[PDB]
């Protein structure tokens, strides 16, 4: 209806609780493997944040897998930084990790993150 | 880290995608029954929005149930309005539904919704 009222902080309050569930390992349903480093997560949050995970978990066979192995060229620290961003809206971008974060975001299909990385690199040139 | 940058619209963009997954019945894992009316949802979203669902899905036995039956006194329209709020931040509060919405929010343990209903009722007295 056009007569709805809206609670400004609701989406942020939901995301905070999804990160608390991840930290306590509550109802996590997939393990993402990056060069033998393992990360537990919720398939719905991964799909909501990435073009790659949206394609994987809408596939009739891959939707039922409990383990997903990423390309061996993907950096575990870069993946960890992006997983934290998915669950908090905060991106830990530093001189020492920006190249790995950008390459991981290109693979995961997160367009706005790729664009921000490109702008930060161009400013230091 | 204290050096993070933040994307303002991220939490709202995630919530929009969680509602799109619900509308297409993608990776929904529970049916909520309200007086023979059935509602499909994601347990993680329900827990993130309600004290009652947080208690139910952290229980060692109830966490594995695929069907949850609510008290027969709960109004299906009131529940539908609150489920839509969980997935969008928008609450369809109207003169004809406010009493049912408030009673449902008290049962579901959604404090700020109860408080807003009370304020809207007090203004019409």
């Amino acid at each position: 209806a056009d007569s709805c009222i809206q609670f400004t902080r609701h989406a942020s309050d939901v995301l905070l609780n999804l990160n608390r569930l991840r930290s306590r390992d509550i109802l996590t349903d997939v393990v993402i493997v990056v060069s033998r480093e393992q990360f537990r997560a919720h398939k719905t949050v991964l799909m909501a944040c990435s073009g790659l995970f949206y394609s994987i978990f809408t596939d009739q066979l891959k939707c039922n897998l409990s383990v997903i192995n990423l390309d061996p060229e993907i950096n575990p620290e870069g993946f960890c930084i992006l997983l934290d961003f998915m669950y908090t809206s905060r991106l830990n971008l530093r001189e020492g990790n920006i190249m790995a974060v950008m390459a991981t975001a290109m693979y995961l299909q997160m367009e706005h993150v790729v664009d921000t990385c490109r702008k930060f690199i161009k400013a230091s040139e | 880290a204290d050096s993070c940058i933040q994307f303002t619209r991220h939490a709202s963009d995630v919530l929009l995608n969680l509602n799109r997954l619900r509308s297409r019945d993608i990776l929904t894992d529970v049916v909520i029954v309200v007086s023979r009316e059935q509602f499909r949802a994601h347990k993680t979203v329900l827990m993130a929005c309600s004290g009652l669902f947080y208690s139910i899905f952290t229980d060692q036995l109830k966490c594995n149930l695929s069907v949850i039956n609510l008290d027969p006194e709960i109004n299906p329209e009131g529940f539908c309005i609150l489920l839509d709020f969980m997935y969008t931040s928008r609450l369809n509060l109207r003169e004809g539904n406010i009493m049912a919405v408030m009673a449902t929010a008290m049962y579901l343990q959604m404090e700020h919704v109860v408080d807003t209903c009370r304020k809207f009722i007090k203004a019409s007295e």
Partner: peptide
Amino acid sequence: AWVIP
């Protein structure tokens, strides 16, 4: 909080 969206 609440606002008119």
